[PDB]
């Protein structure tokens, strides 16, 4: 005594379980290979960038092309105890993702440059 209202017969919604696997497939999970380090390869010391440093309060970098702006802003930030305003990528005609990295006003750009090694 339960009627059939509508003339269709849709598939009856069943139970379906979560996986409770008897073993994990790959033993350990993988370690990431795109760390604070190898995301950022090295700085540009090119007349361009050195002008961009002094003037625009930036650095300029060559970065792993797999990087977001989010990854660079948090890579830079970790390595150089520095706080970024805005990352700004481009890809060189070459294979290099060059990030331009504005630093937040309270920090200088020339100062940090000397700290890291370029100038």
């Amino acid at each position: 005594k339960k009627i059939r209202t509508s003339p269709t017969f849709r598939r009856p919604k069943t139970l379906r379980l979560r996986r409770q696997p008897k073993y994990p497939r790959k033993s350990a999970p993988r370690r990431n290979k795109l760390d604070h380090y190898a995301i950022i390869k090295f700085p540009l010391t090119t007349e361009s960038a050195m002008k961009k440093i002094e003037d625009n309060n930036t650095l300029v970098f060559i970065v792993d092309v797999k990087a977001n702006k989010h990854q660079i802003k948090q890579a830079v930030k970790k390595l150089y105890d520095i706080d970024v305003a805005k990352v700004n990528t481009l890809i060189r005609p070459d294979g290099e993702k060059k990030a331009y990295v504005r630093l937040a006003p309270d920090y200088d750009a020339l100062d940090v440059a000397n700290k890291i090694g370029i100038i």
């Binding site: 009627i3 059939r4 209202t5 509508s6 003339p7 269709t8 017969f9």
Partner: protein, 241 residues
Amino acid sequence: KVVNPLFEKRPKNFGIGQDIQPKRDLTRFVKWPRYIRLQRQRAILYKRLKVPPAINQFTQVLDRQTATQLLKLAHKYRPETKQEKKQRLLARAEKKAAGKGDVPTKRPPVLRAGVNTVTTLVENKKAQLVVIAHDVDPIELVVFLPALCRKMGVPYCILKGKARLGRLVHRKTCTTVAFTQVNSEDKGALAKLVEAIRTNYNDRYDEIRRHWGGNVLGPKSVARIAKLEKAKAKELATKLG
């Protein structure tokens, strides 16, 4: 007083072109999936087509009082289950080196199960009553059996339910079930059952062999045909008589 005057009736008309039909039961006109729709319109074919007698004879199935009586009897001789088997071994192993181990004791009698066991013991006349299921799935398994039974003078009957036949023994189904022996205390019973079966199956096996049984139409057809006959009757019955 109880009564508000706000409460009106507001009764809906399910006419035509009128306030929209209520969601009435529709099982009749449901578009069922293929697996259902098929399994029904087999049953029709069985009913509709001419079924030959030796597939029909499984319709005449045992009637309630009798089958229950039969299963009340069987329940005695349901074959030794699991665990029970181990218990019978374990007690024998202890008794061998403890307080005189005879070995064979006296093994009691039980039900017999699959067609192949039965069908040796219907050629043999080992069995005194055979029980067949009516709804064995590929029939060819169990078609001869009644005709074989009756030849060997073996009371045979057709229970409803290869499952509930199969729940005597401890498995999903069983096509067949056969008593070779029964205990003296439960002897008379078996015989009171056997005799009432053979009145019903063996002894009228000619009638059963003759009797086909499909060839009945859709009532939807029948009820049209009878209407035409009631038209044909009123044409030549009330006029003269």
